[PDB]
Amino acid sequence: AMASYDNVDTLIEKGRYNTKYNYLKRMEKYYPNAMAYFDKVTINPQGNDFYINNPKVELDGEPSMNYLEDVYVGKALLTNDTQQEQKLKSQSFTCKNTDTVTATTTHTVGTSIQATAKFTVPFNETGVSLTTSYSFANTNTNTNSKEITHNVPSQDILVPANTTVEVIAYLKKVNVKGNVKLVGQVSGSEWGEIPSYLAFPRDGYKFSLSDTVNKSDLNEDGTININGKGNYSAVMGDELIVKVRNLN
Amino acid sequence: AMASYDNVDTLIEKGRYNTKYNYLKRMEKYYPNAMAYFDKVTINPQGNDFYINNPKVELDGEPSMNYLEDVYVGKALLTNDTQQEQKLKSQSFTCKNTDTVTATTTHTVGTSIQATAKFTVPFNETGVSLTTSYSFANTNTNTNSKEITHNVPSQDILVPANTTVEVIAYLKKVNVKGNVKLVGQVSGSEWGEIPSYLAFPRDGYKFSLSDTVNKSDLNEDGTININGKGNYSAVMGDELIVKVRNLN
Amino acid sequence: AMASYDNVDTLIEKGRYNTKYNYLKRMEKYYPNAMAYFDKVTINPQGNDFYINNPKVELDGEPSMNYLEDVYVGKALLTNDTQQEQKLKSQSFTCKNTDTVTATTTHTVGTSIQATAKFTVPFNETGVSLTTSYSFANTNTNTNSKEITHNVPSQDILVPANTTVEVIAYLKKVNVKGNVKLVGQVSGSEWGEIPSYLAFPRDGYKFSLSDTVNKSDLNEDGTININGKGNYSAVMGDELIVKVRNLN
Amino acid sequence: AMASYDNVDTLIEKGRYNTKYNYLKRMEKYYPNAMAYFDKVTINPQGNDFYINNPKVELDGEPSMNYLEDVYVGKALLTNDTQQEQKLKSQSFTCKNTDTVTATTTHTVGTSIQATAKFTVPFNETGVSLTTSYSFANTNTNTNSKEITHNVPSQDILVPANTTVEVIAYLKKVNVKGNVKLVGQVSGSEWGEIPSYLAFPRDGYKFSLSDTVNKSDLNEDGTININGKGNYSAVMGDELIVKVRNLN
Amino acid sequence: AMASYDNVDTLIEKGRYNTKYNYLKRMEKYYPNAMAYFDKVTINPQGNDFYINNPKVELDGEPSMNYLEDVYVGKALLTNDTQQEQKLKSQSFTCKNTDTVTATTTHTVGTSIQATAKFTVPFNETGVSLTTSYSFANTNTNTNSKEITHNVPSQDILVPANTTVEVIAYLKKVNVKGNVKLVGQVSGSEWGEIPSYLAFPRDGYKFSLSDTVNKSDLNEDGTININGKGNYSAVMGDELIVKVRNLN
Amino acid sequence: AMASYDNVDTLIEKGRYNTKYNYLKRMEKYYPNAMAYFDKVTINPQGNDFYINNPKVELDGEPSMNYLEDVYVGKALLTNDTQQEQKLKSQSFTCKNTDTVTATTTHTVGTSIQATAKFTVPFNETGVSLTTSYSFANTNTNTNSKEITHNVPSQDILVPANTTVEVIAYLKKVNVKGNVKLVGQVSGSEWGEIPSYLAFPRDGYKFSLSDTVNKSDLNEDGTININGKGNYSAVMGDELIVKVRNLN
Amino acid sequence: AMASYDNVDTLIEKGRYNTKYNYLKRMEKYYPNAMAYFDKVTINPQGNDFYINNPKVELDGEPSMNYLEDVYVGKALLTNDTQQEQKLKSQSFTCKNTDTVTATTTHTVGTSIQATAKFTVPFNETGVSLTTSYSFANTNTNTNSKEITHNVPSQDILVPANTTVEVIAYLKKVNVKGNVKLVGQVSGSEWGEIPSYLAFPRDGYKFSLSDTVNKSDLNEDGTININGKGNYSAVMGDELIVKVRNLN
């Protein structure tokens, strides 16, 4: 109604810590030997489907960078001698990286029929065999590739009449951490599974974002209000540094 | 004529619930043992062909987002030192994902002819055979790939004379739910099949959107008026967040 | 001269119904047992080559849509903080679907020559054979792929100085029915075949669009005037719904 | 000098009818039994190389269309709510069709050396053979693909402040006939062959476009003036019908 | 110094006719039987490396066309109904043609070890062999493809408020002859070979463009001045004919 | 708080020299024979994850170039004769270089059943065998390609009414060294390993950028301030030199 | 300090001639028989890494062209009949040339187990064998392709109201020689090897650009000043000749 929350994670982790509490409670039937064993249980997620009705995401704070490696540094010297202000372009550059994975299976069913026959009349054991084969292969491939391109564009620079500019692009591969603030109305469940510890069973939990928050803390349509900021740590990225400069 | 409906789904589901009623009625000949068994029958669709004459679709309400994972965060620092307002471009990024499926079948028909012959004269059993093969393989492949690209464009930013801008693109993969309102005139049939329950037969129903609505609730041309809103839950998507900012 | 027609189909179907009349007439020689059998004959087309001289096609009426499935919904939040009206771009998206078909045939012709020889002197039957193979494979592949792309573009939006826009693209796959009106002068023949009914022969008809219309209903150059509207039912398609909106 | 011709075809066909006259004349040596046999001779072309010096081609008359099939119909609804005249883009579409042809040939030359040896000491006939193979395959592939794309572009539409446009692209595959008028100076030969009729020989004719026209009907440089119109029947094609329309 | 030449070909052919003179002179040692045999010698080029210092190429004269075949004719009808002057685009078209050539070679080295052994105790000759293979294939492929694209662009046409335009693109494949005039300073050698006539030897000539022209006809830096026009016969090409036309 | 550092490298190398000190200290238990052996130990990195919160990177100093080889030099002569200022384009050029790496593994499991039988009745030993095979291959490929493109763009040049321009692009492949200055707040650890010297063990170190700097030299959030310049030696690159020039 | 050099080549060749002097000096120990043998030694480079700090490259002098062959000549006739100044586009053209190189190696390890058994009871020697195979192939491919594209763009031409333009693009493949002037500060070494002459050893030289120039001819940071011009002979290239012309 009027109360809101500051993350979807403060709800998801609270629900998972409720699931790890319920599942460990469910062990007071036959295996209460590991009861207070509230660790190394590894509740993993499998089916997140929360929806943020009416979302208003927008990023705040500069992204925190983790620099991996340089990719390209391209200079370009664009001279104009045409008694008129031209618009010259520097060079481009793309860097693909494909990773294919394939798994095919063949089933062959052959069949042969030999009809050997030895005469032994002309000279010793001069036989003549005549076989006939037939086979049938039936393969079933299904590959999967994931391509990723980092294109450095080609800047068009208004170079004046008789002068040069000097562009320097410097691409670099990073992965960022950052923060992002959003508001909205979350609602929905999460089905996963509790992997069987080597003395425990495997159970398929499923909780919702309505039984993990105080009742009457949700709107009339089951949605609970969030107004906070979510993190997006460890996201692959880029960083271009262009420096166009007129030298004359 | 003057009466309209608020979905095509309120017609499709009503027709399917009519088909599940008729098909269960058809069991009072030989197998009325499971008669009130109005469940687990799984009437599946196979041949939807309704046409919305004169459609006026338009989306209302902000799409409800379900955030899957981050794809890319790309910063770009575009400096201008050219005593003139330039227009500099940040870097691009594409992310493909192909999934190929293949099924080939080979038919081979070989044939060999051996002509062995043992002399036994020079020394023990020194024979010399001479075979001759011939085969014929005839394969028939037919693959199928489905590629999907999420391209983050390269913004061109009017950076003033001696200053820098600082673009931050942040792509994210989501799948949305939303609502969409449309008006028009639906008309057409739906042919599917009723899968045979383990004590039931399989029958190929086919109903239309004219016998699932009150007669004289359709126009002169068989079409029934709809004026409402249709849902589009669970649609793969994206979400870009660009923040160009002049720092100086 | 002065009389015109309202379709090319009212001519094509009339010619085919003339061909099905002539071919059934041709059965009063040996097989008049199925004479009034004016059905299940399946006159199929094979060689349409009518030309519409001076065509003036133009579509009338909104296309009737048949909605198949959603493909993509992409939001984009483009913020400007640069004290200047920038032009920011949302993200793109492409969706390919390739279907390859292949048929190769290999012809192999091998040849071997074995020269076994058993010494039997050192110990029991210690022979040493030396064969020599030679083969020749000659394959002939000819594949065929058909790719189809549904590209959602990247809108560039004039976002004012310090504010954001909020683009929502929503692609959807449909196949449309519609109507299309054209005028012109049709002329030309249609060669097909009449498939042999299980008590009938196969005959290769060929009629023209000049002997299927009243004589003197054609111009001096054999062409007959059409002025009407042709249908284009069941054509694969798309439907994009863009909604750019300034939120502040 | 001052006389010109109205086609290059009225020259090519006249030269071929001269070649078919000369070649049939050449049969009064040994086989004059089929002499007036001025048909079913099938003079085919092999080496056209006429050049049209100073050409002035330009198309006249609307192309005569032969409609094959519809390819795509794409609607797009572009709404603007930004208090400013934006320029929004509809969706694109491409349709490839590749046809590959391949022909590879492998030559294998193997060689084996077996060294079997039966002990017969431990128990019955317990021999141990040890072979050694070596082969050499040398293949030579040379494929050939021909791709063809029909791209429907993405129109950018100036949609006013608070309103929508409604684009409808309708691609269609046709092949056209048309006419085209050109002037210039043709000159050059045509080498082909006269296929051997089943009672006739095969001869490799070669005529020029200077001995097929009245002498002094050519300029000083051997070229003969043409001023007419050439046909281009049966050319694969497209037909797009865009209808942008502002609805409000 | 002050004398110039009118081709590089009048130098290259003169040098080759000097080489064919020298090489035939070199036959007065052992084989002067074919001495005046100044024909069928086929001096072929292998190593042209002349450089045109300070070139000023520019084409004169319209290219002489040799028409091969039509490729595409695409009509497009772009209607505007938006109470504003829009800019609509017609459809595109590309036509690829790839020709791949491949040559791989495999070297296999196998090895087997069989260990057959016949018991003959349980019943007649019930032996059990156990072989073990090992091979090593080492292939080396190196292909080569040459793709060629003929792209017909998509014209954007300023269609006025309520009216239509009607674009007609007509691509055609030709190969042109033309002339081209250039000035500059040529200098450099040409190494080829004189193929051995069936009574002659093979010799590897090498002449320069300084010993094929009168001395003091070259500048101080060995370069000889050319000022003339060079031909470019038989060059694959295109010919587009666009005709945008406003019909209303 | 108030003290900052001038590199992230002066921290990383100091931490690694601390790790090489600790690990060599850890050898005074069993192997102090190589104790002062402070070399040839090769502490390699494996898990860098420092984040630069609030980074302000910007390049200073011109990049130091190391010229590898020329790639392309493309002239273009764009003449205008249209009594109007046109905008003509020069030619483009791209240079890809792909390097694929593949590793597949097949597992085959065959099975045959022969049923030979010798009659010996008609003549000597005329037997007839009939075998039947069945196999199952299951391969698992996973390739990896890395493409790199160096695109030289196509400059559009405003050539005046009756005159020519003369563009000269000159791409060249280099790899640069340069310097880059950044400020920010670094924080995070580095997990690697100390490879086992041939008399030493292997240990997996892990240090952070907070225990390698004087305490109270870090902010309240564990981050240590950096304000200096980092090097980016040996980065593949390009260098374009465009020279548009109006000649008349 | 104040003295500079006019090439990097006058330094590299001087250093190599110093290396060839030192290495030949090193032969007065055991093999002084070939001492003055100052030729056919072929000092080849392997590890150039000189860096030109603060480079100011810029091309002088028109490139000297060596014409290889014509690639394409494309005419285009763009007519405007729209009572308005349109902007029409000519056709494009691309010419790829890929060269792939591949090297894969397979390692197979098979294993079979036969279990033959001859009954001899029903009739003569009617045995039944049953084998069982198993193999394991492990291949490792790594290809490498190098694509090169020569794209002729599609000029957009402002054709006036009722008139035509006539574009002629003429691409041509050349390789240029040219000169290029640069200034900067070179510094760095060159590691190569001296290949072993058939009576000599192989030695891996390594010299720097600081011990090949007079000391105190270098700046304080080891760099030696260059101010001259470097050549770039034999660089693959293009040459486009566009001639737009308004004919009316």
Numbering used by the authors:
A (entry chain A), B (entry chain G), C (entry chain F), D (entry chain E), E (entry chain D), F (entry chain B), ...: 13 to 260
Article sentences:
Etx is a member of the aerolysin family of β-PFTs (aβ-PFTs). Pore formation disrupts the membrane and is central to the damage caused to intoxicated cells, and consequently to the symptoms of disease, due to the leakage of water and small ions through the pores that may lead to cell death.
Although the samples still appeared heterogeneous, approximately two times as many particles remained after clean-up steps as compared to the non-VPP dataset from a dataset that was only 25% larger. This resulted in a final map at an overall resolution of 3.2 Å. At its narrowest point the diameter of the lumen is constricted to ~12 Å by the seven Lys108 residues, which protrude into the lumen (rectangle). In the intracellular side of the membrane two aromatic residues, Phe131 and Phe135, form the usual aromatic belt found in β-barrel transmembrane regions. Unique to Etx, and unlike lysenin and aerolysin, the individual RBDs are well separated and do not interact with their neighbours, and thus do not contribute to any oligomerization surfaces.
